[PDB]
UniProtKB/Swiss-Prot annotation, chains A, B:
Disease tied to this protein: Duchenne muscular dystrophy: Most common form of muscular dystrophy; a sex-linked recessive disorder. It typically presents in boys aged 3 to 7 year as proximal muscle weakness causing waddling gait, toe-walking, lordosis, frequent falls, and difficulty in standing up and climbing up stairs. The pelvic girdle is affected first, then the shoulder girdle. Progression is steady and most patients are confined to a wheelchair by age of 10 or 12. Flexion contractures and scoliosis ultimately occur. About 50% of patients have a lower IQ than their genetic expectations would suggest.
Lineage: Eukaryota, Metazoa, Chordata, Craniata, Vertebrata
Covered residues, full protein: 9 to 246 of 3685
Disulfide feature: none
Region listing for ANK2- and ANK-3 binding, in residue ranges: 55-64
Organism of origin: Homo sapiens (Human)
Protein name: Dystrophin
Tissues expressing this chain: Expressed in muscle fibers accumulating in the costameres of myoplasm at the sarcolemma. Expressed in brain, muscle, kidney, lung and testis. Most tissues contain transcripts of multiple isoforms. Isoform 15: Only isoform to be detected in heart and liver and is also expressed in brain, testis and hepatoma cells.
Length: 238, 238
């Protein structure tokens, strides 16, 4: 259930630690189960990682080894690295499972959790309108009569609005019977009622605010935001 | 270029304001261009919105009208609603453009910007592994020989790794010539080199850490995170 290869983590985690020592022009380590024991190297990896200067104690002594690791554990704790169950004794007395654990937790912190930090940074280059438009388009990708590219004229014919509710709630009505209703005005009241009565959505709009040469962008946007607030919300980002 | 229908915003923004008075069991307004003039109603909408008690001044007087609007502008400013160019004189002297603007800015704050707040709340039910897996799968959707469902055994044959680089950089090599290379071990070194030499990616992995009955999840995860860090990052959320 794990396929936790301790022999493989020994190598790749050493390659990872060495690739960072490389980035900071620092000596490489060769054995992960004993080269992290005195605490000096953990402090150096933490220097390139953090930016701080981490004075290291002398020691040939266990005592210094332990000071050196406690300081690295405090630096790590300030950086919010998971450390549950990893003490300095464990690193100084060479517990290979917890030494691999510590290195995994530093890798998760500074590399694996960047996936999520880059996504959040991606949200930030983005506004709500664009997230909403992507949600409408993904929701309506299997409805060929619909092609949404704006919050104005893509909605006059009444299809996009019905397709969007339909894509989330196929249970509420039949796609083709909206498609053969030639009246746009009638596709619209249909969707507004399904949205008011099946979904609880207040009718901000009248068919003439949508079915018109110059529909109002803000009112449609606002209305479609109401649908988004109560339907599933899978969107694309970055 | 706008298709800014002031006649439509007058109605839908009144429907929006009334729908909130409804949610807080408050009186409806009927004319948006004069019913917001003394400041009392803006304070009531702000009560349901904010949770606060917004004492309102008496006044039949412009003076009180203005106090009433200044207090609502301060409440709004504390809530980070855009107010550039909207003063209380504008609301009290009935400037329909700025009254519509104020109401649009409150709607954007408390409704339209929930799209982006719900996405960020969605990231929070999610970890990096799952965002990465979705990115691999979306990146490799047009590569039929590839089907990624884990960070272990879906990568042993060497295809998924090559497909993922290929989907972002079709320029670097030829898909079919990786597909006809029967040696998995050889598809892997191929990808690691393309990643090391065309992409700058450090070879954390050896073909035997991947091409093996029990590949190590963490090492692959870590390695694939390196690719994600330098390739385009479109993912699916919520």
């Amino acid at each position: 259930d794990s396929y936790e290869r301790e022999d493989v983590q020994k190598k790749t985690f050493t390659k990872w630690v060495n690739a960072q020592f490389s980035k900071f022009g620092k000596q490489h380590i060769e054995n992960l189960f004993s080269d992290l024991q005195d605490g000096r190297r953990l402090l150096d990896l933490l220097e390139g990682l953090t930016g701080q200067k981490l004075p290291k104690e002398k020691g040939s002594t266990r005592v210094h080894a332990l000071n050196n690791v406690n300081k690295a554990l405090r630096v790590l704790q300030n950086n919010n690295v998971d450390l549950v169950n990893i003490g300095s004794t464990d690193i100084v007395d060479g517990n290979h499972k917890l030494t691999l654990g510590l290195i995994w937790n530093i890798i998760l912190h500074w590399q694996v959790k960047n996936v999520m930090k880059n996504i959040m940074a991606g949200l930030q280059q983005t506004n709500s309108e664009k997230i909403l438009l992507s949600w409408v388009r993904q929701s309506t990708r299997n409805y060929p009569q619909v092609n949404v590219i704006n919050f104005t004229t893509s909605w006059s014919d009444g299809l996009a609005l019905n397709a969007l509710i339909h894509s989330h709630r196929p249970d509420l009505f039949d796609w083709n019977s909206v498609v053969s209703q030639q009246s746009a005005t009638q596709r619209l009241e249909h969707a507004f009622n399904i949205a008011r009565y099946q979904l609880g959505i207040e009718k901000l709009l009248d068919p003439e605010d949508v079915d018109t040469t110059y529909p109002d962008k803000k009112s449609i946007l606002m209305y479609i935001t109401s649908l988004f607030q109560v339907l599933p919300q899978q969107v694309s980002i970055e």
